[PDB]
Design a protein around this ligand. Structure first.
Ligand SMILES: O=C(N/N=C/c1cc(Br)c(O)c(Br)c1O)c1ccc2ccccc2c1
Ligand SMILES: [Cl-]
Ligand SMILES: [Cl-]
Ligand SMILES: [Cl-]
Ligand SMILES: [Cl-]
Ligand SMILES: [Cl-]
Ligand SMILES: [Cl-]
Lengths: 148, 152, 150, 151, 152, 152
């Protein structure tokens, strides 16, 4: 397992845009299973929405893109914080996303992504976000790693 | 129904609030058909503390969000017109997102212009599509379907 | 016995960034409560506690146990009543026998387990532990008092 | 140079969030004048309290943005775009005078700072000018800063 | 109308909220003449994250803002006493600032004391001037003109 | 070893940072014996947004935290003096907290004075006890046992 501290050593994202808390499964060039805890104590809930906290669907996707990003980094150079500290990640395409169940405080948002296709710095992954066994969202995306 | 709406009009229609209200002004609007709006991008926004340190790049997913909110405003006013009292008890869920492509990164100092056109709508379910533009160039394309629902 | 953030928001007066209970999984009147708060990196406290080493504050673990306990005491007397809830305030008088055994970090489901040690009138004494995946990460005893909002 | 983006502004000014009030610089003439701006969006924390339901960019923050522009002008005039010397310098602002507010600034506005050097003697720089939104003057003010060694 | 008001009272009179309410307590007040209030300066303020890293210094412009808010409080209570119901239908507008001097940097642990007197006043327009002090020493001087207006 | 330390010195000794650095200044410091410090309480602190709306009260658990940080500063410096290079490698952790009692609510405008005394110390293990005061009145009491550990 990779914990927050390791996640920090690979992903360029920081607060309040680092939406992955832990990595539970990793299989180079194949897939990755990870998650982020959802708590009321997040600033995003002050406006989405007042008196009715609902984790933004677009942030679920960002969390999936980030999980895929970690798969890309590690699959490319392994766990190398040195190289990681010079790159960043750009979103290229998002497609076929569907939300089925709203994610709320108290939820364990689990990301399940598999590599669809990749070449060089460009990676295309797809999968689902699950809560307690159920699919709350599915999506496909292509992200690109680049030098800062 | 007017065609130009300022931040105060937006706050009376959309349920979104800080830090998730991503539309500052509406420049033009055709009921049940089209809407053009924009959000200014400044370094003085909290998302930039983490995306990314020393390299402020407005998140691509937040661009989608702003396009969806533009559609949501279009949806609501096309349904009930500018009715703040009916609006204060509704929210908006994302149902789907398709064919989005990011062409140019958005940075502090940009005037991110949203252009959404209604592709199909029935009752509460609206499906809009369009682009996000900075200085007349297209920085993003997207298609999305969102649902308006009575808060309960 | 199962209360979600929405039910919690109606009883407790605490709001962001000081509402430290996300869900209530078990509740037995005048006896005990079991609730939890999710710990994620996406929380403002982690910007300074501490940079490059995220560790949920121990005093905030106690705060969450207090809120859980205050919630237990309140509903025990009046049940789920948003009305009365606005006319009352549960503040804590003492805290004691606190012990931190394990660090809580982003990714943990911080579970609160409080029971009613004793109560007399509006003064309630609760105690228990903070648990993460079965282990006891902390423990404490608290005495709260229920009063009229004012 | 003449045009600097947020990237360059970060290497010259010490100001950071939530006090970096200049997004880009569109004009720069050493020892003469500077034209820069900051976008005003609702998605800014200050709007949570100034004011609820009535978002109005604080007037003092406009004067601040103007002060930040003058400082970048002063610094660049002395050493040009030098991130390294930048880290060793300070620009204390000593006084502010003749500031008038004419039109409120709100979300959706492009706050353009127009400043010119009014006097430069030794380490003391005196600048003045206006803040403009869409060609109209929304505020004017005078400022005096001192260049010193950071510590 | 008394002369000591705490944050609870200031909240019911001034329209400013976090992170822009910069007056914590009013210690002295003379209708239409003068007021003495203060704001505690602590490191635990978001503004210090950027002003400046590893060198916390309270923004000079914010000290003026605090003096303005003190003036606004005096102005309002002078005209309507402690009236929260009417106070809710107003906001203050900065009209002018002049003669400001920043003599001493203000930092965490300082009790920023505001001293203002009415230089002129007629209707909603009030002109105040004075100093900001820390432990008896003048940290700043300023003159400002504000206006109380119907929020609509 | 001085007895007066300001925010810039506190920043070199404690690893705490916004929004968990709860000590603004140290007025008295006696090695292995005691420390007197304080934190200014202002409305301009994020914590008051939710504790509580329309009724700002400084969290009691945070008073404790501020007392512990003081005791922690006392601990480190009693052992190494003002050694920033070393402080950067150590970190103090709460082991226990006992006999905590809150007597008076803390609010904006208050100067929260920490008074901690060394009850016992052997190596990296320290037991401190004391009170939190506001204008000579005791608003809280507590005892803590801390541990000075490696930061790795
Ligand atoms: O008054 C207290 N907490 N909350 C009070 C309160 C909360 C809300 Br909401 C409210 O609307 C009102 Br009226 C309150 O008095 C409190 C907190 C800590 C204390 C510590 C020692 C003694 C008294 C205390 C009272
Ligand atoms: Cl959503
Ligand atoms: Cl992106
Ligand atoms: Cl801790
Ligand atoms: Cl203003
Ligand atoms: Cl300043
Ligand atoms: Cl408390």
């Amino acid at each position: 397992q990779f914990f927050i501290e390791h996640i920090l050593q690979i992903l360029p994202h920081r607060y309040p845009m680092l939406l992955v808390d832990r990595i539970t499964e990793l299989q180079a060039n194949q897939k990755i299973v990870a998650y982020k805890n959802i708590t009321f104590n997040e600033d995003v809930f002050n406006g989405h929405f007042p008196n009715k906290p609902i984790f933004p669907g677009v942030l679920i996707v960002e969390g999936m893109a980030q999980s895929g990003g970690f798969l890309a980094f590690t699959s490319l150079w392994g766990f190398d914080p040195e190289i990681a500290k010079t790159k960043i990640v750009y979103f290229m395409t998002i497609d076929k996303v569907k939300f089925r169940i709203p994610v709320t405080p108290g939820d364990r948002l689990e990301y399940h992504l598999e590599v669809l296709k990749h070449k060089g710095m460009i990676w295309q992954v797809g999968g689902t976000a699950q809560v307690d066994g159920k699919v709350v969202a599915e999506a496909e995306l292509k992200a690109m790693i680049a030098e800062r």
